[PDB]
């Protein structure tokens, strides 16, 4: 039904003083039957790029018949 | 690939009855045969397959109550000796398999009763009064629901116990004539 | 030395302190205040407006009225705990400093309602569960995939348990074979036979 | 979706995205708690997903070139 | 009797606790509902006057290794009057 | 020795049973003896050696119904090299609520969001584990973090105040 | 006193319908019990409850087998030929009312007799697969069925399943065997 | 220790000095109302309608006065310290006296309100005990196994929680013996010194 | 561990029973037929659940007709 | 104390000297006792060549009957007179009856302990711990100075082999009320003992 | 109302100047009264909306309240004659997923609290690189 | 007697149990573990059991006399299982006995005099089974049915599938 995302940069952590690890967060509002559920995920840069390419492929394959 | 018992040929004629009867005992509720007794003759991943095949074949044969010949003909391509062992095993303890099958029919429900225990006590005194003398029956239940065993407890006095016995006897008056 | 209405033990300190507060009232108003608190114990209900109005004459504040009601309930329940009678309780209260008039006035109502109070205390004593009701259904199976022909019965049972007063009841459900049902009935009858010889 | 109970026939594209999730063992107890999910999408939701992700990608590229 | 006003009020509190165990004077019945609004009001008002770090320590005060001085310095960032 | 080994939490039932079997001792007497020794030692170890001198110790232990040769063992166990261990484990009995086991964090810098092209809002992610086995993970914005830090500093200051007052207000 | 029984009928039928709602239909929220007492002031000072017990007894008595109305009149007369018994016209009136709520009563009894999850609707779908991430060409079809299951008085659960040709055929065969077993057991 | 007020908070107290004490008393009553019956900004609309006075600054003044009262009762500081603190606000001596009196008359109620902000921990509410002896079971028919049943009630953040337990006479004796030691330390020299030198 | 064929569930076995309810506490002549079903199903984890429910004759014949229609539709294309 | 027909037939057969001698009877009785008692038993209970002359069917039927009789007697706490009378009604002699009574007496205590170890119970407490504190302040309250008591119960559930601990916080008045309640329970126990 | 809310969401997403609104909304056949009502309101409380969104959170758990209590422990079952301070912290974690609030009860000594304070100071030093 | 003697026995037991003081569980002999705890309490469970029968009708007797059929008490590993299963087996046997030959009262033994084996009872339960099977025979046509709609099923086979997709298609992201 609905989706949200947040794109940001890490600037530190408990065991590393300095790091610039990029990340992406997603929330998926999936209709689990009559109720509703939210699925929270985190992706890295290569995983996000592969996901985008796979979605492009799915869009290409989803408009073949009509 | 023929009858599901085709995997049984590897086992010699001597060690057949033990495996078969211990499998039937496992079906009825006792333990099942262990790997370290026939490991040389089969591999575990296929030992499970042959175990399940034997169990399900026996259950189907007993449930559908086949005649002698049709059971005989399905075992034509087995060992020259295993056939009579199988048929004698069916002839001996068919009733136990039928009882287990009938018990499993009651498994078609939300929950089933496994076993129970009751304890009787005499309540002497409490903070409210010191002349109580109240007999109390404690009933413990172990009811299996979904895939887990859930314990329950009920505390009853004489009146509740009498009413429960009355209702259960009313039900038993129907159960006894339904047979 | 000691007193009996406290179970053959020395009388507590708070009751001793607050009985004097009880003693600074009128006996007739006590005959209604003790009646109200006794009815509250009996389960009829309590009208705090009634007691506040009744003791409004003496301008007793929150602490004093609170202690008075607490003492009334505590002492009455303790006296009924050991089936103590009015004649002994009046003397014991006199030993506690309460004037004879107040002891007579209170025992006028205490002595004439002990039976309902004691039976209610017996009913409302400690307990963990109670079987509110029971329901059953009988099934007769005819055919199944596992077994072509069965022709045997089944019993369904439901038990409703009240874990506390003013609480929702959590039902219990189960499915039984005929054999388990019969053995359960026989064992219940045995327990009843053992459990009916204690009276 | 060729047919359904409430309609004898059609021919409509549909998507079934399945994913794998690994959660920290600490946050779930003593279990590894690796779950799989499935979401059934349509054309409009996929289009919105792709537009948003392409917008994010364009933002990233602009930042890179800036 | 003077020390009673400080710590000798035990018996009255004991009796009040005994009474309140099974009883609820009507004034206190709706007080339980009034409590939540009282706490919401006090937390919100404290939010209004929350002590906020609008002030800073001059950079370079990192030499201290103590459990008494650096905590004192830390509170200076919030400008709170002590 | 068995009673002492029990005070550190070790299970030593079987050795006690073997001793009872060997010495032909009814359980009713062995249990009473064990309970007496355990209670006596527990009450003895509550106090520090400064509040319980050996003199008063054996004077209270006064011979009536008492052997003379056992008080030496009692003193040796109480005042021996095992006392530090007993105090250390005894100190561990003074705990009610869980203690912090670990603390890990991660600070992010939100650049973009679905509801905002450029957010640019620093944020902190916090994870906490407790000795009870509980694990907690949550976000914590900046203002709330400042509130938490100020509260911690204030608690440190007040704890220092109490530490100072303890010596000054109880050595008069 | 002889109030209502031989005089007012409206309170009596109102009480019967209120009891039907309270004990069979599972709507005990607001009933006429609390309104008739202060709107009809004919409450007997002493004997007021026990006649409600006979109300309940007659209500449960007919609820056993639901016989033909020809045989209900005989039992109604036999039970009600005594003091305070119902009239012939009132006997006909109540006999009619059973027809007015017979099927609803039976359904509520069966509904208030369930012990396991019940089927509350079937919704299915049949699709044709095209391709996947790695596979580039597929045509094998599938079927999707979702089951509405739920025990009475509880939130419904949903179950989803997948199928192909062989499993659908097997399930059809099993259901056909079920039908055959149903057919052969009548005689 | 002393209310050395903040400058920004003081700026919100500038409305009252330009206001007569007649409405300052009403504002204090409004602060008490906000604590007890809760806050309703609609009262700002009512005040504007009945006085043609801006709602924003009235809200600022009432919240500032309430905050002053809360942090003044939160410490129980003496009256002289309060008089010293408010001497910096440039307030009339009559208004200062009114503020000090209003603060004085509503300290205990406020401190009763504030005590519900501390962390909520499980707390004892009531305890019930029943005595029973086991006589029979499904495996043994004649038995004697006495036990003590206990129902312990605890309150956590405003809810009622119940626990069902069991024990034997020796364990009950040990419990009483230990808990008696628990409340025997408060009568000792160490506890007395700690509780006396602090206050 | 990634396969497209299994997405949500796949039932591994199908068992049923036929019986009728004879009597009840609130009714001594209940006497209506019913048919029950037991499904044990496997998810992606490889486990096996057990879901059981009860039906009536009209519901069962509706079930059978719907599965028949599904078979026809899937066969045609 | 009721018994079934099959057990009656088994005990009828047990009396015949042709079927069993004294040695065979003693061995069967001891084998039944071992099967009932030992937790590491096997088919070896009947692998004693002295018994290898009678049909196993009767052997095992009588074995089951004897085990059932011992179980019933233990459950009903039967004594010498009841066993002797029933065995006499079974057409026994003064030798077999004496040996049966002696075998019952030899390991009666273990059988009494075994049947008393079946069943569940409510959680059983074992000990307590307490911490004494002196509350000072909270975030929104700055001067209280009130002692408070921390309590911790050690209980073990027969349902789950673990030692969960229950914790609650008490004040002095609550602690006094709790101690009074426990003392009342103790006095009730003493009253029961005196009677 | 949904269309107006969507327009406002777009405007705050792009953080547009009111001139952009005045120019663009009128292009889609909207009468001038609507455009003026939009632009005046956008000028009124626009930056408040973006600041509000800037503090928005996506994770299902947030820290909402902080409370603490200070106690002095003096004796217990296995020891006596103590003068040890202790501290308790309560954390208000809002489980936005369940629309409910839980609470975490933690306990500290002086050394543990000092270590916690040092960790928080390190986190603060991390946040100070973004000036 | 019992109403007082039972109280005296209870009092004696309580006194004896009070005599023993409390000891830490780590130093608890099994007797005290029984007294001052419940750590060694097992539950009640019954397992299905098979017993030899004094019926020599043939083939099954070969199994009954073989080592394959273990002795009845030793068919389960744990002794508690043994005792529980044996007790339930005896109780069920006696219950089946109650519905069989039983020297009962002046009226309950009346039917036992001339009762054929489960044959004379069949006449008056055949009536109940008649109602059961006639209720089953109904609803197979009473409502909903007939369901004969052999029009939606097989016609689809004749027509088949007419259209199909072409070549792989794609476009540029918007």
Numbering used by the authors:
A (entry chain G): 135 to 200
B (entry chain H): 5 to 183
C (entry chain D), H (entry chain B): 1 to 199
D (entry chain I): 133 to 198
E (entry chain N): 128 to 209
F (entry chain E): 53 to 224
G (entry chain A): 1 to 187
I (entry chain F): 9 to 85
Give verbatim excerpts from the published study on this entry.
The Commander complex is required for endosomal recycling of diverse transmembrane cargos and is mutated in Ritscher-Schinzel syndrome. It comprises two sub-assemblies: Retriever composed of VPS35L, VPS26C, and VPS29; and the CCC complex which contains twelve subunits: COMMD1-COMMD10 and the coiled-coil domain-containing (CCDC) proteins CCDC22 and CCDC93. The COMMD proteins form a distinctive hetero-decameric ring stabilized by extensive interactions with CCDC22 and CCDC93. These adopt a coiled-coil structure that connects the CCC and Retriever assemblies and recruits a 16th subunit, DENND10, to form the complete Commander complex.
Purified BS3-crosslinked CCC dodecameric complex was vitrified on graphene-oxide coated grids for single particle cryoEM. The central ring of the COMM domains was more clearly resolved than the peripheral HN domains due to their relative flexibility. To partially address this issue, we re-processed the data in RELION4.0. Several rounds of 3D particle classification with and without alignment combined with 3D refinement yielded a reconstruction with overall resolution of 3.5 Å. The HN domains of the COMMD proteins and the CH domain of CCDC93 were better resolved in this map, albeit at lower resolution than the central core of COMM domains, facilitating further refinement. Although the complex studied by cryoEM includes the full-length CCDC proteins, no density is observed for the CH domain of CCDC22 or the C-terminal coiled-coil domains of either protein, indicating significant flexibility in their relative orientation to the COMMD ring. In this structure, the CCDC22 and CCDC93 linkers make extensive contacts with the central COMM domain ring and the peripheral HN domains, while the CCDC93 CH domain is partly stabilized by direct interactions with the COMMD ring via the HN domain of COMMD4. Two PxxR sequences in CCDC22 that form similar turn structures, 145PHLR148 and 199PVGR202, bind the HN domains of COMMD5 and COMMD3, respectively. The extensive interactions mediated by the linker regions of the CCDC proteins appears to enhance the stability of the COMMD ring and likely explains why only tetrameric sub-complexes are isolated when expressing the COMMD proteins alone in E. coli.
